RNA sequence: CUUGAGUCUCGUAGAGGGGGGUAGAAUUCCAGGUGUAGCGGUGAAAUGCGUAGAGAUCUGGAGGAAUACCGGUGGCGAAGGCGGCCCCCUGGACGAAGACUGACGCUCAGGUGCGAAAGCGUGGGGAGCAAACAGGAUUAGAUACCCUGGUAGUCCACGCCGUAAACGAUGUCGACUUGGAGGUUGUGCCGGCGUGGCUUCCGGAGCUAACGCGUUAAGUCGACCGCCUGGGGAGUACGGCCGCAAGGUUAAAACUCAAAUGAAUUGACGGGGGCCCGCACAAGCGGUGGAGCAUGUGGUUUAAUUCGAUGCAACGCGA
């Protein structure tokens, strides 16, 4: 119900799923959408196309706040990194800056290698 | 094949209208090499179709196809043991062939008495998006849409 | 190539010399390899000590997402 | 890898500038390298294998320059 | 006596070691805000978490463990090993100009010490990971591989263990014998020309069964030590010693076999790689498999149902 005009998009692109959260500059979420909740399960969920649909729904979820400019903070190695940023532009936002915020330990022991 | 030494085959136009698209439809509908039987079925079907829609012989047959031609289809590909249906665009020649094949097979599985009427009834519904020829186009387009995420190799 | 510390005859790379140090870190703040800048092995080690020593005093950043 | 979109800049090229900055930082490889634990015995077996294969291709290239195929 | 060995003087490089302190990133947990229906995971799922508000995002805090980049067939150490930064304590190596001692050396059974990880004891700590364990799958079965969790343990202090493919599968010391290309660290002289230490790759003679090694030798020699004597039984039993235990160490025989083995060769094969082909798939059309009959075969029956063919490549085959 409030008007912000200046939000931040957080793409969370993992190998299994993509989550798009659009927050204001203060970090309070306005809306979100995921590839899994966009009608995609399993093999579909982890595609660049499933992330594009997830981005559009998140842009459709925050339409009542009238966001005009949008910072994009991309995290993770997922296939939905690049295609989610395009869909935010296709919706009609202005991408002011794009940053990679993927957390890198400089840390803990990772899990053991899978013997598939 | 593995060599790709396949050139296109010559095909004579239809006698009554000189339509190349119509000659291919007779061949698709022909059974056992009896082309004269297939031409007489196609002609009398078109006379019923043209009179029933009032438009014409040829381009009223073109209106039947334009509602049956598919524009996207899925080809199988198995990646992790599970087979992905990968949607791929259909080139113009195959769009015509599929539509004519879908019309003939839908017409054949119909309860009319004669095939010439049976074909005309199928084409008439296809012109108005009611037949079982257009329903198979419906299915292909939604099988291709359920797989749009796989538009890659 | 062309190590600029043999060329300038440096005796220690002097972490307080932030003007020099910023030439040997990337935009995100990582030390650039001697293979890229063509620094000698001897000075590349002192350069890395000075950069880590300046990172501690907050004269230089560890990452770009602080 | 912080890309600030510049004035009168088309989106795609800024998206191209972003893809470049993340690859030069090698963050995607760094994430893929840290997802499973790598034993010290294996990291060394790889490092070595990398060096000996990096070495072999150089001499193979030096040698192939002193050759004719036909 | 001074050339081997060592001492002193000046400097250099170094993850050498021991003790203390500290920084940044990240994971996890806790508390709170925004927000809302999924998250997570997989080949695909499910277990699991989530409307008691998860996941995502922001704020504050607690905690432990490891130090991205630099980073390198780079360095240091007898070996095992050693990696953020700073200080304290400490070992060794190398180089330059001399001086000094005056062969004062090398090797070493027994002895002594050090010795990855796992493990053990006592007391702490416990984020992440993860034997055991539990569940979900997969499967014919799946005491697994995969998934979700998860305890010892991994961390610290002290003590024990004393073993590893602890490997260069190559004992230590010394001398001698064409070359090339590097790396690293000193040093003298004028980027150029020397001289040292350590180190990586290629290769000559030579050596080797061959593979290969090749001035860092597996070449030519000397000194001393360790060890071997066909395979299995067996590094096992018994005894001794050591250990809290787990076990370690030393170490047989009966019996049995006629080989076991190393290297390389030619094939064949691979759920190895590359490049090709074929109605091999794919793209299509028509069939067979269901029905009746024809015909061949098997089986059964019969006095006999003559004999033969009997994966592809026998079965309308000899006929
Ligand atoms: N990431 C650092 C330590 C932390 O994590 C390393 O790999 O050594
Ligand atoms: Mg995992
Ligand atoms: Mg001394
Ligand atoms: Mg002894
Ligand atoms: Mg231990
Ligand atoms: Mg313990
Ligand atoms: Mg205890
Ligand atoms: Mg597990
Ligand atoms: Mg070892
Ligand atoms: Mg080794
Ligand atoms: Mg041995
Ligand atoms: Mg050699
Ligand atoms: Mg024993
Ligand atoms: Mg005993
Ligand atoms: Mg086929
Ligand atoms: Mg039959
Ligand atoms: Mg026979
Ligand atoms: Mg017979
Ligand atoms: Mg045959
Ligand atoms: Mg035949």
Automatic annotation (TrEMBL), chain A:
Query: What Pfam families would the database entry show?
Result: Ribosomal_S11 (PF00411)
Gene Ontology BP term (one): translation
Family, according to the entry, reads as follows: Belongs to the universal ribosomal protein uS11 family.
Report the source organism.
Answer: Escherichia coli
Record-given protein name: Small ribosomal subunit protein uS11
What is known about what this protein does?
A: Located on the platform of the 30S subunit, it bridges several disparate RNA helices of the 16S rRNA. Forms part of the Shine-Dalgarno cleft in the 70S ribosome.
UniProt keyword annotation of RNA-binding present: yes
Please name the HAMAP family in this protein's record: Ribosomal_uS11
The UniProt keywords, alphabetically, are: Ribonucleoprotein, Ribosomal protein, RNA-binding, rRNA-binding
Domain of life where this protein originates: Bacteria
> GO terms for molecular function, please?
rRNA binding; structural constituent of ribosome
Subunit arrangement?
Part of the 30S ribosomal subunit. Interacts with proteins S7 and S18. Binds to IF-3.
In the UniProt record, which is one GO cellular component term? cytosolic small ribosomal subunit
Q: What is the lineage of its organism?
A: Bacteria, Pseudomonadati, Pseudomonadota, Gammaproteobacteria, Enterobacterales
Read off the InterPro entries from this record.
Answer: Ribosomal_uS11, Ribosomal_uS11_bac-type, Ribosomal_uS11_CS, Ribosomal_uS11_sf
Automatic annotation (TrEMBL), chain C:
Q: Which InterPro entries match?
A: Ribosomal_bS18, Ribosomal_bS18_CS, Ribosomal_bS18_sf
Q: Which GO terms describe its biological process?
A: translation
Can you tell which superkingdom this protein's organism belongs to?
Answer: Bacteria
Q: Does the keyword Hydrolase apply?
A: no
Instruction: Identify a single GO molecular function assigned to this protein.
Output: structural constituent of ribosome
Q: Which UniProt keywords apply?
A: Ribonucleoprotein, Ribosomal protein, RNA-binding, rRNA-binding
Which residues does UniProt call coiled coil? Answer: none
Q: Mind naming one GO cellular-component term on file for this protein?
A: cytosolic small ribosomal subunit
Family designation: Belongs to the bacterial ribosomal protein bS18 family.
HAMAP family in UniProt: Ribosomal_bS18
Quaternary state and interactors: Part of the 30S ribosomal subunit. Forms a tight heterodimer with protein bS6.
Protein purpose: Binds as a heterodimer with protein bS6 to the central domain of the 16S rRNA, where it helps stabilize the platform of the 30S subunit.
Protein name per the record? Small ribosomal subunit protein bS18
Source organism = Escherichia coli (strain UMEA 3162-1)
Automatic annotation (TrEMBL), chain D:
The keyword Ribonucleoprotein is annotated on this UniProt entry? yes
Q: Which PANTHER family match?
A: MITOCHONDRIAL 28S RIBOSOMAL PROTEIN S21, SMALL RIBOSOMAL SUBUNIT PROTEIN BS21
Q: Name one GO cellular component term.
A: ribosome
Annotated region Disordered: where?
42-70
Listed Basic residues bias regions: 45-58
Spell out the protein name for this chain. Answer: Small ribosomal subunit protein bS21
Gene3D superfamilies linked to this entry: Ribosomal protein S8
């Amino acid at each position: 119900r409030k008007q912000v005009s200046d939000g931040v998009a957080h793409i969370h692109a993992s190998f299994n799923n993509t989550i798009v959260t659009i927050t204001d500059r203060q970090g309070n979420a306005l809306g979100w959408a995921t590839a899994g909740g966009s009608g995609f399960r399993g093999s579909r969920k982890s595609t660049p196309f499933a992330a594009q649909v997830a981005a559009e729904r998140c842009a459709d979820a925050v339409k009542e706040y009238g966001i005009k400019n949008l910072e994009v903070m991309v995290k993770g190695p997922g296939p939905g990194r690049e295609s989610t940023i395009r869909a935010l532009n296709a919706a009609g936002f202005r991408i002011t800056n794009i940053t990679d915020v993927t957390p890198i330990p400089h840390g803990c022991r990772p899990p053991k290698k899978r013997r598939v | 094949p593995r060599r790709r030494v396949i050139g296109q085959r010559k095909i004579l136009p239809d006698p009554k209208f000189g339509s190349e698209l119509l000659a291919k439809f007779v061949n698709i509908l022909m059974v056992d090499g009896k082309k004269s039987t297939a031409e007489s079925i196609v002609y009398s079907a078109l006379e019923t179709l043209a009179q029933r829609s009032g438009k014409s012989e040829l381009e009223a047959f073109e209106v039947a196809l334009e509602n049956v031609r598919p524009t996207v289809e899925v080809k199988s590909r198995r990646v992790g043991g599970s087979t992905y249906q990968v949607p791929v665009e259909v080139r113009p020649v195959r769009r015509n062939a599929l539509a004519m094949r879908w019309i003939v097979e839908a017409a054949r599985k119909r309860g009319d008495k004669s095939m010439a009427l049976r074909l005309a009834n199928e084409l008439s519904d296809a012109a108005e998006n009611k037949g079982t020829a257009v329903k198979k186009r419906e299915d292909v387009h939604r099988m291709a849409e359920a797989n749009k995420a796989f538009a890659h190799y | 190539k062309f190590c600029r510390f043999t060329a300038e005859g440096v005796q220690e790379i002097d972490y307080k010399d932030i003007a020099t140090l910023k030439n040997y870190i990337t935009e995100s703040g990582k030390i650039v390899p001697s293979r890229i800048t063509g620094t000698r092995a001897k000075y590349q080690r002192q350069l890395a000590r000075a950069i880590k020593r300046a990172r501690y005093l907050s004269l230089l950043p560890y990452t770009d997402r602080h | 890898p912080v890309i600030k979109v510049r004035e009168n800049e088309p989106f795609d090229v800024a998206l191209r500038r972003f893809k470049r900055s993340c690859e030069k930082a090698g963050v995607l490889a760094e994430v893929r390298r840290r997802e499973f634990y790598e034993k010290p015995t294996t990291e060394r077996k790889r490092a070595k294998a990398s060096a000996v294969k990096r070495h072999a291709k150089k001499l193979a290239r030096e040698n192939a320059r002193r050759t004719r195929l036909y």
